[PDB]
Amino acid sequence: AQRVTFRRRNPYNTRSNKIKVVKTPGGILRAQHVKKLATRPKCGDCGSALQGISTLRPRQYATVSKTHKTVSRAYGGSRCANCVKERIIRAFLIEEQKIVKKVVKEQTEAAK
């Protein structure tokens, strides 16, 4: 039944400043400003949240190790597993089709 308000300069209900109410060890209710939550990194091909990569603020990534923001597979930390598998399969099939086209062309101008 004790009423609390903002503790900073901004007096408006903006997304920047948001308030939680906590009971301090002094026995009173007090306001506390909450920071914006972090966002999971997303795959660069399909846009789904990357698996096994920590969710932090943009500047909090510079203070953790590489194993907390990467995956041991190729493109790990940038693309998910299915996208990488699709990339591998597509690249191999494209190269095989290029070989087949080159052989067919070598045959078709071999006539003259």
Partner RNA sequence: AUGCCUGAAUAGGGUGAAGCCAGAGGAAACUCUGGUGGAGGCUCGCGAAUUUGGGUAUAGUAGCAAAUAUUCAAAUGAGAACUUUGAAGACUGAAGUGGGGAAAGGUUCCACGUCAACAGCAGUUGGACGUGGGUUAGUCGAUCCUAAGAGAUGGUUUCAAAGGCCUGACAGGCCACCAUCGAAAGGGAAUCCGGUUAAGAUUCCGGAACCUGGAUAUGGAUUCUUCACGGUAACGUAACUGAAUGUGGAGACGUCGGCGCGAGCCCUGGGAGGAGUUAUCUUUUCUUCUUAACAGCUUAUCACCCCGGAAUUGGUUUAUCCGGAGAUGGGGUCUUAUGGCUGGAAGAGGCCAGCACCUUUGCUGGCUCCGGUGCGCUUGUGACGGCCCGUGAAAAUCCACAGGAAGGAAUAGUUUUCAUGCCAGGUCGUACUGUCUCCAAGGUGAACAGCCUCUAGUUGAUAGAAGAUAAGGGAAGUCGGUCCGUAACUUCGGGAUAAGGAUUGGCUCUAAGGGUCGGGUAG
Partner RNA sequence: AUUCCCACUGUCCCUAUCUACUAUCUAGCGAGGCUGUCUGAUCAGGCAUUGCGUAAGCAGUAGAGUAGCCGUUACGAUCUGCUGAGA
Partner RNA sequence: GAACGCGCGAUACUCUUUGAACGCACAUUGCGCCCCUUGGUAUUCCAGGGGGCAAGCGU
Interface residues for RNA in 32-61 (CB under 7 A)? 32-44, 47-61
Q: Rounded CA gap, 10 and 106, in Å?
A: 74
- Contact yes or no for 80/46 (Cβ under 8 A): yes
Binding to Zn ion (CB under 5 A) within 12-71 occurs at 43, 45-46
Q: Rounded CA gap, 7 and 10, in Å?
A: 9
In the list RNA, Zn ion, none, the entry touching 93 (Cβ below 5 to 8 angstroms by class) is: none
In the list RNA, Zn ion, none, the entry touching 67 (Cβ below 5 to 8 angstroms by class) is: RNA
Q: Does 89 engage in binding with Zn ion (CB under 5 A)?
A: no
In the list RNA, Zn ion, none, the entry touching 46 (Cβ below 5 to 8 angstroms by class) is: Zn ion
96 backbone dihedrals φ, ψ, rounded to 5°: -65, -40
CB count within 10 Å of CB 22 equals 10
Q: Does 90 engage in binding with RNA (CB under 7 A)?
A: no
The residues of the shown chain that bind Zn ion, judged by CB under 5 A, are 43, 45-46, 80, 83
